[PDB]
UniProtKB/Swiss-Prot annotation:
Phylogenetic lineage: Eukaryota, Metazoa, Chordata, Craniata, Vertebrata
Organism whose genome encodes this protein: Homo sapiens
Residues of the full protein shown: 459 to 911 of 1258
GO function terms (MF aspect): chromatin binding
Name the UniProt record assigns to this protein: Cohesin subunit SA-1
Encoding gene (name): STAG1
Coiled coil start-end: none
Origin: domain of life: Eukaryota
C-alpha cells in the first residue's frame, strides 16, 4: 500500500535517473514477468498522483514519468503481449483469465479516476495526452453495467475542459480519438457521447466562423489571428476521425486560403491548418459519395470543390513559408493519387467525372519542390526533418510509378542528384571496406 508506493516511487526514480532504460514501454515489458503484481497496483499509482503529501512531494518530471509508466502497464495488462518492437502470440487459459480480470479492474478503476486525473493535470499538455491514451483499453460495456453514467459525464466534462484549454496537436488528437472510441464502440453510451461531441463541435464552429469574419473584414489584430488559428486547430484535429461535413468548414478554409493568396499576408499556421482541414473535408465528401448512390450533379459539385482546392495547393507551393509548401506538396501528392484513374477500380466507373490528370505546369512545380525541399545542401530535429523529406519523396515517388507526373523528367533529377554515387561509388565503397 505505502510499501507498494515506495517501490513505484523508486521505480520512477530508477527510470528517470539511469540511461539503462530509454523507453518506459521497454522497462515495464522487461519487469512484467517478475513484477506484474506491482505494475498493476493502479489504486496505488492514481493515489500517488491524486493525493497531496504529508512527507516528500513528487517533482513535475516524476509525476510525468509515473503517468507514462502507469499507461505502459495499462497497455501491457489489456493487450497481454510485449509492446511493438519487443513482440515475437497464443495465451494460456490462465493468461486469458488474467487479461479479462485485469481489463475489468483497470476499466472499473480508471472510469472513476481518469476524470479526477484529467481535472488535476488539465494544463500539462504532455500528461493529458498520455492520460487520454487510457480509454482505448476500456471495456466500454461497463459504462452501462456498473450504473457508471455519472463517470462518463465526468470524463466528457474534462475532455471539454482539455479541448477548450489547449491547441497542441498531440492533445487535440488524443481528445479526437477518445471521442471516436467512446462513440462507435457501444450503443448504450453512443447517444450520450454523440450529444457531448456535436455540442462541443457547434461551440467551436461558431467561435471559428465569428473569428474568420473578424479576421477577413479587417490591418488585423494579433487576437484576430489567435482566434482563427486556435479554433481552426481544434476543428482540423477532430476532422480527421469525425465527419464534420454538416458544418460547411471547407467554405471558410477556402476563403482564408483565397485571401492569403490574394493579399499574400496569411499567417503560415492558418494556411497549413486551413489546408489540412479542407483536405479532411474533401476525403469525407468522397467517402459519402462512394458509399451512397451519387447523382450526376453530386459528382460535378465535388469535382468543382476538388479542382479549386488542387488549384489552391498549387498556388501554395509559391508561398514563402516552407511549412506551407510542404503541406501543399503533401496534399497534392495525396489528392493527385486519390483522384487518379485508380478511383474507377472496384466497378466504381461512375466516378470518371472526379478523375484529375495534373497539367504540365503542376508536374513541373511538383518537380521543382523536390529539387528545392527534398534535395538540400544543408541534433534530434535533423533526423526528424530527414524522415519527413523521405515521406515527401515517397509520396512523390508514387506519382512517378503511375505516370501521373513525367516519369522521365523525374528520373533525370534522380540521375543528377545520384551522380556522385554513379561516378565514384565503387572507389568510395572498396576504400571504406578496408578501414
Ligand atoms: C495564402 C498564400 C498563398 C500563396 C502565396 C504566394 N503568393 C501568391 C502566389 S503568387 O506567385 O501569385 C505570389 C506569391 C501567399 C499566400
Amino acid at each position: 500500500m505505502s510499501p507498494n508506493g515506495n517501490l513505484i516511487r523508486m521505480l520512477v526514480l530508477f527510470f528517470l535517473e539511469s540511461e539503462l532504460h530509454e523507453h518506459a514501454a521497454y522497462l515495464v515489458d522487461s519487469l512484467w514477468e517478475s513484477s506484474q503484481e506491482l505494475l498493476k497496483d493502479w489504486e496505488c499509482m492514481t493515489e500517488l498522483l491524486l493525493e497531496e503529501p504529508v512527507e516528500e512531494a513528487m517533482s513535475d518530471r516524476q509525476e510525468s514519468a509515473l503517468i507514462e509508466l502507469m499507461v505502459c502497464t495499462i497497455r501491457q495488462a489489456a493487450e497481454a503481449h510485449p509492446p511493438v518492437g519487443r513482440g515475437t502470440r497464443v495465451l494460456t487459459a490462465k493468461e486469458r483469465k488474467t487479461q479479462i480480470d485485469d481489463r475489468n479492474k483497470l476499466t472499473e478503476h480508471f472510469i472513476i479516476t481518469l476524470p479526477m486525473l484529467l481535472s488535476k493535470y488539465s494544463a500539462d499538455a504532455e500528461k493529458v495526452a498520455n492520460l487520454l491514451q487510457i480509454p482505448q483499453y476500456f471495456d466500454l460495456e461497463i459504462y452501462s453495467t456498473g450504473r457508471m453514467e455519472k463517470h462518463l459525464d465526468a470524463l466528457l466534462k474534462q475532455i471539454k475542459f482539455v479541448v477548450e484549454k489547449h491547441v497542441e496537436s498531440d492533445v487535440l488528437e488524443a481528445c479526437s480519438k477518445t471521442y471516436s472510441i467512446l462513440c462507435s464502440e457501444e450503443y448504450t453510451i453512443q447517444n450520450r457521447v454523440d450529444i457531448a461531441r456535436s455540442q462541443l463541435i457547434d461551440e467551436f464552429v461558431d467561435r471559428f466562423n465569428h473569428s474568420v469574419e473578424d479576421l477577413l473584414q479587417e490591418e488585423a489584430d494579433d487576437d484576430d489571428i489567435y482566434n482563427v488559428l486556435s479554433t481552426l486547430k481544434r476543428l482540423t484535429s477532430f476532422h480527421n476521425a469525425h465527419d464534420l461535413t454538416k458544418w460547411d468548414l471547407f467554405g471558410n478554409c477556402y476563403r482564408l486560403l483565397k485571401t492569403g493568396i490574394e493579399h499574400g499576408a496569411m499567417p503560415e499556421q492558418i494556411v497549413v491548418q486551413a489546408l489540412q482541414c479542407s483536405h479532411y473535408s474533401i476525403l469525407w465528401q468522397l467517402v459519402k459519395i462512394t458509399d451512397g448512390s451519387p447523382s450526376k450533379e453530386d459528382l460535378l459539385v465535388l469535382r468543382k470543390t476538388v479542382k479549386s482546392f488542387l488549384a489552391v495547393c498549387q498556388q501554395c507551393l509559391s508561398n514563402v513559408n516552407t511549412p506551407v509548401k510542404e503541406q501543399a506538396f503533401m496534399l497534392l501528392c495525396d489528392l493527385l493519387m486519390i483522384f487518379s484513374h485508380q478511383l474507377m477500380t472496384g466497378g466504381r466507373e461512375g466516378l470518371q467525372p472526379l478523375v484529375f490528370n495534373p497539367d504540365t505546369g503542376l508536374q513541373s512545380e511538383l518537380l521543382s519542390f523536390v529539387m528545392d525541399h527534398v534535395f538540400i545542401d544543408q541534433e534530434a530535429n535533423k533526423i526528424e526533418a530527414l524522415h519527413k523529406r523521405r515521406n515527401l519523396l515517397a509520396a512523390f515517388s508514387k506519382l512517378i510509378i503511375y505516370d501521373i507526373v513525367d516519369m522521365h523528367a523525374a528520373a533525370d533529377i534522380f540521375k543528377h542528384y545520384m551522380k556522385y554515387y554513379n561516378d565514384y561509388g565503387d572507389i568510395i565503397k572498396e576504400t571504406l571496406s578496408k578501414t
